[PDB]
Amino acid sequence: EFVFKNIDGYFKIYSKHTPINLVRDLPQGFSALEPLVDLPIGINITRFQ
Amino acid sequence: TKLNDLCFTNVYADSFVIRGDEVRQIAPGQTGKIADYNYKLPDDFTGC
Amino acid sequence: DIVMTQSPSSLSASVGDRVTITCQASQDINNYLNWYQQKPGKAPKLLIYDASNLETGVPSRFSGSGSGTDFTFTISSLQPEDIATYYCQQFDNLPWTFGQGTKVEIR
Amino acid sequence: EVQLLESGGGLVQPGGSLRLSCAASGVTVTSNYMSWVRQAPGKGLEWVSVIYSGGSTYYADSVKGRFTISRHNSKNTLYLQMNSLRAEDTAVYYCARDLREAGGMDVWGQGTTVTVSS
């Protein structure tokens, strides 16, 4: 599970890789997403794939 | 003195090897043989 | 800052005699040394570059040697076309202080 | 085709402003290094001033403010003004372009004689 975020022009990534159990397409509970790395690119990007 | 505790989002660390005397010529706003073809510091260069 | 003065200042010889020129600097210079021929009246002309390679037009009698602070220049046979002044200077650190200059005149 | 000519000078009175012109064709003035050198009649070389690429002018300490420099891209030419020229500056002037560390300043321009004698 990842969040790719643009913090004030800087490309940050919040990430996590956790064990799960697919049961009903929607687990119940809560979690958190600690950051991976910031890459200071500062260039507008129009698409990703 | 305050560079220890000043927050900057990024530091551009540019590493290379040149001749000895040309180092002092690498200054913010200074111009020369290297400031036009190889590496010129910006007019608002805040660093070291 | 850096002042670069020629070791020889005034050398006079005849036609065909050897000419030895020493080009020293305050401290070590590299790849910033050229051997010129200004000549009286006419426009200056560079003849020898990097002190190792002969340029188109320069006779093979001229030679250059050295790797570092001191570069040496040898003329085995002086010719009337060589009546000139050799200037080698430091075009690196402004201001450009002037050297002694090796004025070679034939007798 | 490549050609470098010069204009300016004469026998104007002392304290009379002048303007040297260096017309070069075949090169790019904007992205090249250039220098001005004055030579006394019957003497050796004597460097004067340097211009870099991007609008950076410098001289020797004695000629700290000597020049007022401008360029025209219609014919790729340099104009260079001196206010109230000096008496002993009577000399032949050259505008020069140096290739630096790949063979340095092989061929020279024309050079024009300027006399500011009284």
SS3 content of chain A, % helix, strand, coil (to 5): 0, 35, 65
Inspect the interface and report whether the beta carbons of D104 and C91 lie closer than 8 Å. Answer: yes
- Cα A29 to its chain centre, rounded Å, is 19
Give every CB contact of residue A4 below 8 A, 6+ residues apart in sequence: A11, A12, A13
Inspect the interface and report whether the beta carbons of C44 and D45 lie closer than 8 Å. Answer: yes
Compute the nearest-CA separation of C25 from chain D (Å): 17
User: Rounded to 5 degrees, what are φ and ψ at B27?
Assistant: -135, 155
Strands C102-105 and C45-49: unpaired
Contact A38, A10 (CB under 8 A): yes
Rounded to whole angstroms, how far apart are CA atoms D14 and D34?
28
Rounded to whole angstroms, how far apart are CA atoms C63 and C74?
5
- C with A: touching (≥3 Cβ pairs within 8 Å): no
Experimental method: cryo-EM
Rounded to whole angstroms, how far apart are CA atoms C102 and C86?
5
Say yes or no: B4 contacts chain A, CB-CB below 8 A. no
Compute the nearest-CA separation of C44 from chain D (Å): 6
Contact C52, C67 (CB under 8 A): no
Residue A11's nearest CA partner among A46, A48, A43, A49 is: A43
- Distance of CA B1 to CAs B4, B5, B45, Å? 7, 8, 18
Rounded to whole angstroms, how far apart are CA atoms B31 and D56?
7
- Cβ atoms within 10 Å, residue A42: 12
Resolution, in Å, please?
3.9
Residue A48's nearest CA partner among A8, A15, A11 is: A11
- Cα C41 to its chain centre, rounded Å, is 18
- Distance of CA C14 to CAs C20, C84, C101, C107, Å? 13, 13, 19, 4
Residue in chain D lying closest to C103 (CA): D44
Contact C96, C89 (CB under 8 A): yes
Rounded to whole angstroms, how far apart are CA atoms D39 and D91?
5
Say yes or no: C86 contacts chain D, CB-CB below 8 A. no
Residues from chain A that touch B9, judged by Cβ atoms under 8 A, are 8, 10, 38, 40
Inspect the interface and report whether the beta carbons of D60 and C95 lie closer than 8 Å. Answer: yes
Say yes or no: A40 contacts chain B, CB-CB below 8 A. yes
* Mutation site, D38, D43, D47, interface C, largest C CB count within 10 A: D47
